[PDB]
Paper text:
This chromatin-associated complex, which we name 55LCC, uses ATPase activity to process replisome substrates in S-phase, facilitating their proteolytic turnover from chromatin to ensure DNA replication and mitotic fidelity. SPATA5 and SPATA5L1 belong to the CDC48 family of type II AAA+ ATPases, which contain two ATPase domains separated by an intervening sequence and an N-terminal region that typically is used to specify protein-protein interactions.
While little is known about C1orf109, CINP was shown to interact with DNA replication factors and was required for genome stability. CINP required expression of all other subunits for its stability but loss of CINP did not substantially affect levels of the other three members. Notably, the individual CINP and C1orf109 structures observed in the 55LCC map were nearly identical to the structures solved by X-ray crystallography and predicted by AlphaFold 2. The cryo-EM structure adopted by the C1orf109-CINP sub-complex also closely matched the T-like structure predicted by AlphaFold-Multimer35 (r.m.s.d. = 2.94 Å). In agreement with these observations, recombinantly purified CINP and C1orf109 behaved as monomers in solution while the C1orf109-CINP complex formed a stable heterodimer with a 1:1 stoichiometry and a Mw of 49.7 kDa when analyzed by native mass spectrometry. By contrast, we observed no shift for the C1orf109-CINP sub-complex in the presence of any nucleic acids. We introduced mutations in interacting residues in both C1orf109 and CINP, and tested WT and mutant proteins in co-IP experiments. Similarly, corresponding mutations at the interacting CINP residues L162, S181, and S184 impaired CINP binding to SPATA5 and SPATA5L1. Conversely, mutation of the more distal residue L178, or the conserved PRKP and RKIK motifs located at the N-terminus of CINP, did not affect complex formation.
Residue numbers in the entry: 17 to 61, 68 to 210
Write the structure that this text describes.
Amino acid sequence: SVSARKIKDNAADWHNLILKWETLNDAGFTTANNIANLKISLLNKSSSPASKENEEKVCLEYNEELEKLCEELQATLDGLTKIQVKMEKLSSTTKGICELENYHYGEESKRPPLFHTWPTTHFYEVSHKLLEMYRKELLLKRTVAKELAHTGDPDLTLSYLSMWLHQPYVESDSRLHLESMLLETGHR
């Protein structure tokens, strides 16, 4: 049916947006990891006069590079924000498909599944759960990015850096929810 093709395409769209998210998150981690390491080197600053002079000049250039890296990290957040808005579109699309099915074919309890077993509303419930997770993850990343650029403790930097990569909200069950949609719709 037409709705089946739309739902299968919607699941594929979720896969592609989640891939773009991971691509940007990995790139952001590289940037965030460069900020942390330069910060720790800058924070590590009765030695020889040559060493003092050298350390002084090197640390001035650390500050310049750190400012460029922080702007680079903000650009990644901008890319992730664009993805999160596209995800809200995808969740809204799933919702609209459910509304189209109800109007054209009546009560869902009396319609057959589009594929194997899922009622069409279950696609929306899963889609909305994914949106909710990435909403929370994006909010957390702005705090992480803010802390990285201002924190002065190496250990905190590592903890925040670990949060950026592990993604406590997305890592919980993003894969399982996505996989269940791809499995039901017959994707690879």
